[PDB]
Design a binder for this molecule. Structure first.
Ligand code: U5P
Ligand code: U5P
Ligand code: PRO
Ligand code: PRO
Lengths: 257, 257
């Protein structure tokens, strides 16, 4: 009884941000999230423009952008609207509720003003979600909970992963899914986004581990691949994005049957 | 065989940042860390100047500072040098090693350029520490690992806390201690810093829980109290800081015997 992305977009309990995402995934035949891990605004925007048609989502780390301004994020929103992708700031909020509400709305970055999606670690308990939702619910935003991590020695396993799923399922007005290595929720209203993805086997020298799009979408039942260096370090980032898009999309179609 | 802060500053395996901190704690009779949770640079600097003599450490969240510039952090360093306290940026690095190294050195904040101490969640595995230490070791910085949290539903318990202690004890060239609710390491070279502290019982409406300085320093064996709203929300922040300093210092003296 697995539903297409387009049908999941219409589920009764779907969050509007999840619905928008699932509809553009189906329309564009993409379940690829670009991890735009660059330090230059011009490179971020040139990647967003060229790869926009190939991606369902662009994931930022704006705290590594040497020339961040709010006007850069206005230009990124123009490209997201044009090419139809969501903006996901990978901030990993991980503090008490009272602190993360200020980190989400305020400071230099004003993340809530431009990010469709953010994510949170569940280690502080559900106050982290309650704090974010104070800002995010009025701004019609969504949140992903980090249920598993791709890195060597990850402690996001067993009862920790189960706690993340329970926390998501109890804050479904704001939480739209997970960062995970696999399907962790049986509820089709939740998105599964998986980092640690490359076409070739291996990892990096600081604990990153890679699995293929076929493994994580096809066998492990995730929805979306998050890809950084597999695209960003390639010479032709557009062709690299197209190879990742086709891999993730076909793995999804094959699983759907 | 408990040693004074001044004697712990001389331990063979002490990190130089921990030694500097322990010496100024002993000199100034303070084991209070101010949590300077304000949105205005002028309020941050006015608190740092007035409360500097009362504190061993000033903890920042620079991502909530509406008017952050690197020149604000230069002014904060001038006050830290004058009054003798360390600067601790409570960034909660919580990503794969390759990402956190860029978040620590780069972007708008250039955290490593001004923060004596930062902290990390252990959930990604030890790559988070390896990534930070690539930047922090050359800059002679230190790191705290988050072994426990003060908030309701915290998952930083049991085997998670034990994993944080093992990770600290295996990266002792860079890791100088813990954010914890209690003594979690038996090794006196490690600092224990405890947030969730107020003189009065209670909490907040977003999962914060408070314990007293006497409870966390005296009974639970921590070294340093981290205090935000108990000071910041008071009318006279200097007198509030002095009440917290005297509470934490006497609890330490009584335990030392
Ligand atoms: O468990 C996780 C959570 C997040 N990321 C993020 O996903 C991207 C992976 O990049 P890459 O290894 O594909 O270059 C990075 O931005 C990293 O911070 C992971 O790699 N693993
Ligand atoms: O387990 C933890 C870790 C960190 N903090 C931080 O310590 C301060 C506590 O502030 P307050 O509750 O004393 O105002 C805040 O900056 C918060 O982010 C906690 O409260 N609890
Ligand atoms: O792990 C493997 O053997 C295959 C080869 C490419 C990616 N996955
Ligand atoms: O918990 C209690 O009862 C005491 C009263 C002040 C703070 N601790």
């Amino acid at each position: 009884m697995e539903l297409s992305f387009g049908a999941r977009a219409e589920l009764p309990r779907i969050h509007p941000v999840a619905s928008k995402l699932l509809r553009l995934m189906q329309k564009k035949e993409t379940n690829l999230c670009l991890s735009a891990d660059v330090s230059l605004a011009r490179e971020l925007l040139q990647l967003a423009d060229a790869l926009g048609p190939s991606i369902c989502m662009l994931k930022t780390h704006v705290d590594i952008l040497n020339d961040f301004t709010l006007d850069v994020m206005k230009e990124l929103i123009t490209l997201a609207k044009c090419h139809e992708f969501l903006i996901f700031e990978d901030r990993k909020f991980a503090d008490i509720g009272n602190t993360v509400k200020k980190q989400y709305e305020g400071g230099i970055f004003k993340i809530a003003s431009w990010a469709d999606l953010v994510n949170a670690h569940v280690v502080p308990g559900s106050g982290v979600v309650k704090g974010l939702q104070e800002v995010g619910l009025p701004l019609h935003r969504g949140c992903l909970l980090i249920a598993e991590m791709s890195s060597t020695g990850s402690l996001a396993t067993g009862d920790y992963t189960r706690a993340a799923v329970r926390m998501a399922e109890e804050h479904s007005e704001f939480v739209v899914g997970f960062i995970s290595g696999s399907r962790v929720s049986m509820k089709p209203e939740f998105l599964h986004l998986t980092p640690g993805v490359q076409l070739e086997a291996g990892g990096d020298n600081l604990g990153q581990q890679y699995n293929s799009p076929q493994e994580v979408i096809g066998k492990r039942g995730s929805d979306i691949i998050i890809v950084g260096r597999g695209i960003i370090s390639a010479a032709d980032r557009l062709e690299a994005a197209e190879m990742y898009r086709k891999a993730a999309w076909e793995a999804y179609l094959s699983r759907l049957g």
